[PDB]
Design a protein around this ligand. Structure first.
Ligand code: NI
Ligand code: NI
Length: 639
């Protein structure tokens, strides 16, 4: 070991970078030997990172000295990882000691601006042609642009879309975890590959369900019911039925679920039928309709287990007028029929398809639903229980036509649609098409989903070269090159950067170690009980893990301007708060007459030139209600 020359090499870098950012990294090299060291530092970068300058020549380091190398880096377009490598090798004379150090540093690259989609769909009569709009994809970077074309003989659903959307969802609320676990339950490596989806192996897929089932139980309240963000939170009755539906259906496939977890959950579902009075659904405009949605879903989950008492099912049925959607009437109809009351069961199923959901989104039912969600969930219940086949074709045609065009879908709607597409995946329907990306005519006996690269999409043209109507769906998703125009619908959001004192602070000419106070202001023209505030951080800004609603600040000495902002955040209905590497997340119940204030501390850390993401707010289960605020073009951090 006498020929060794230990060297300490530490890289100072951002927690993450955004696609297009440039950062000035520092490689601190220390010589803790008793003799000088001549070093050759070879720098390389892989993944979505690139070195701006060249690798440096020799490094002369005397004993005890720490030097710094300035390494300008650039983040390449896309989503994934970036890595920087250093191979330090000492250049020494015959009897002298040698340096030999290998180090690698990985940072996540995430684009500054969220993913945008384009969704088209049409029926082409024999001989008719469809071409993608030329304007349609003007905004996307070609590196990130990927599309999927679905062709069918009958009205379809793109299961590839819903699968990709549930897998991409980043937040860990109870409903979002269950929704995201349903595809990993009913799909397989073979099914996934035939759709063009590249996922994990069946063993790893089953291992993902086991870790999921445990995460859902981390949310089970001491009484047996489940809460949306924390075990300590309020009981979510309809979500307890939802989780119980999933937990029961996983056991049916062969996943182990602790018996005490199931027994306590079933005990709640039974309490919901026999005692609806104890249910407190506070943001619900119509209480009778919300309580009915719960009892009906609890009735269906209990009946699949042969645990629903007929007496309770018969009493819920006496109150069928309370229903504000056809989905709870259908769920109760399936329960009554499963429990032996086919008479009352047939009546509830008939009535279910005759009653629509109120098209006014401002009426909160607390069932995470919509017209879309309910129509999908009802198509699956009818098919699975082989009820009304004549009505299934009208419901599928309606659902097919109303689903495809929606820019934003809740997790609940994506799952509802995934389960309805799984229902019709192997549906006979002959089709012939001539496309722009293939010389040989395309044909099929069922819906065939083909993947397309950015080149194939720009010029995409599909012609029905058959004798029967053909259906097409075209879903593309990429990242925009530049920030889109700020927009808002029902919600509104604005971000102001302040100094720790309380005055305004210009994002350009910010120094490393500078502490800033980020003020988020949210208004809504309607009450939005399920609003999620996501504020993506610019790289170079690092989140101080401090909940300012509690009052925990680096300074309590400063007041007047800052003091009232903290007092305002103290008045907010915060449901959940998260301080991540690359974002500040807060789930907040917005009231129309009470504008929401959120504040968080950030520190400018790594010098560079960074893209500033726009602040966004969205209703999690009415996602047409959303806003994206204005942001400065760049954040410059100086040494
Ligand atoms: Ni030795
Ligand atoms: Ni009664």
């Amino acid at each position: 070991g006498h020929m060794a020359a230990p060297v300490i090499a530490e890289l100072n870098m951002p927690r993450f970078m955004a696609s297009g950012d440039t950062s000035r990294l520092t490689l601190d090299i220390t010589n803790l030997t008793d003799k000088p060291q001549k070093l050759n530092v070879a720098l390389t970068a892989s993944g979505l990172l690139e070195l701006v300058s060249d690798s440096p020549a020799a490094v002369e380091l005397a004993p005890g000295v720490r030097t710094t190398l300035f390494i300008p880096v650039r983040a390449l377009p896309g989503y994934g990882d970036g890595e920087i490598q250093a191979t330090i090798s000492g250049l020494a004379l015959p009897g002298e000691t040698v340096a030999d150090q290998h180090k690698q540093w990985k940072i996540g690259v995430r684009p500054a601006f969220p993913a945008q989609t384009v969704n088209y769909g049409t029926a082409l009569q024999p001989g008719e042609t469809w071409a993608i709009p030329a304007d349609g994809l003007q905004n996307f970077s070609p590196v990130t642009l990927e599309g999927q074309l679905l062709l069918s003989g009958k009205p379809p659903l793109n299961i590839a879309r819903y699968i990709k959307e549930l897998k991409a969802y980043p937040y860990g609320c109870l409903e979002q975890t269950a929704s995201g676990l349903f595809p990993s339950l009913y799909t397989n490596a073979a099914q996934l590959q035939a759709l063009g989806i590249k996922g994990d192996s069946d063993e790893k897929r089953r291992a993902s369900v086991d870790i999921g089932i445990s995460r859902l139980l981390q949310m089970q309240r001491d009484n047996g019911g489940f809460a949306l963000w924390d075990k300590n939170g309020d009981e979510e009755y309809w979500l307890t039925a939802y989780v119980m539906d999933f937990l029961v259906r996983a056991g049916e496939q062969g996943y182990s679920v602790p018996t005490d977890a199931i027994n306590r959950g079933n005990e709640r579902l039974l309490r919901y039928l026999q005692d609806p009075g104890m249910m407190s659904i506070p943001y619900a405009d119509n209480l009778k309709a919300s309580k009915f949605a719960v009892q009906s879903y609890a009735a269906l989950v209990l009946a699949r287990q042969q645990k629903a008492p007929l007496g309770a099912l018969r009493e819920i049925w006496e109150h069928r007028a309370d229903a504000a959607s056809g989905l709870p009437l259908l769920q109760l109809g399936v329960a009554l029929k499963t429990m032996g009351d086919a008479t009352r069961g047939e009546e509830a199923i008939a009535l279910a398809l005759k009653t629509p959901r109120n098209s006014d989104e401002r009426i909160w039912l607390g069932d995470y639903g919509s017209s879309l969600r309910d129509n999908a969930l009802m198509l699956s219940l009818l098919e699975e229980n082989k009820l009304l086949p004549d009505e299934q074709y009208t419901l599928l045609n309606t659902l097919s036509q109303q689903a495809f065009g929606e820019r934003w879908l809740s997790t609940q709607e994506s799952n509802a649609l995934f389960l309805a597409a799984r229902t019709i995946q192997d549906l006979p329907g002959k089709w012939q098409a001539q496309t722009s990306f293939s010389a040989e005519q395309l044909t099929g006996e069922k819906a065939q989903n083909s993947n397309l690269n950015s080149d194939q999409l720009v010029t995409l043209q599909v012609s029905n070269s058959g004798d029967q109507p053909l259906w097409l769906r075209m879903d593309a998703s990429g990242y925009p090159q530049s920030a889109p125009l700020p927009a808002n619908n029902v919600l509104q959001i604005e971000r102001h950067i302040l100094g720790t004192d309380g005055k305004s602070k210009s994002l350009d000419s910010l120094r490393s170690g500078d502490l800033v106070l980020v003020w988020l202001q949210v208004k809504a023209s309607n009450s939005v009980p399920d609003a999620l505030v996501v504020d993506l951080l610019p790289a170079g800004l690092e989140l101080e893990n401090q909940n300012l609603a509690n009052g925990s600040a680096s300074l309590e000495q400063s007041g007047g301007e800052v003091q009232n902002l903290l007092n305002q955040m103290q008045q907010a209905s915060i449901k959940h708060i998260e301080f991540r590497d690359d974002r500040f997340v807060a789930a907040v119940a917005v009231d129309e007459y009470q504008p929401v204030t959120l504040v968080y501390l950030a520190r400018a850390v790594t010098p560079g030139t960074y893209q500033v993401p726009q602040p966004m707010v969205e209703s999690m289960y009415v996602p047409q209600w959303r806003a994206t605020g204005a942001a400065e073009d760049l954040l410059i951090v100086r040494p």
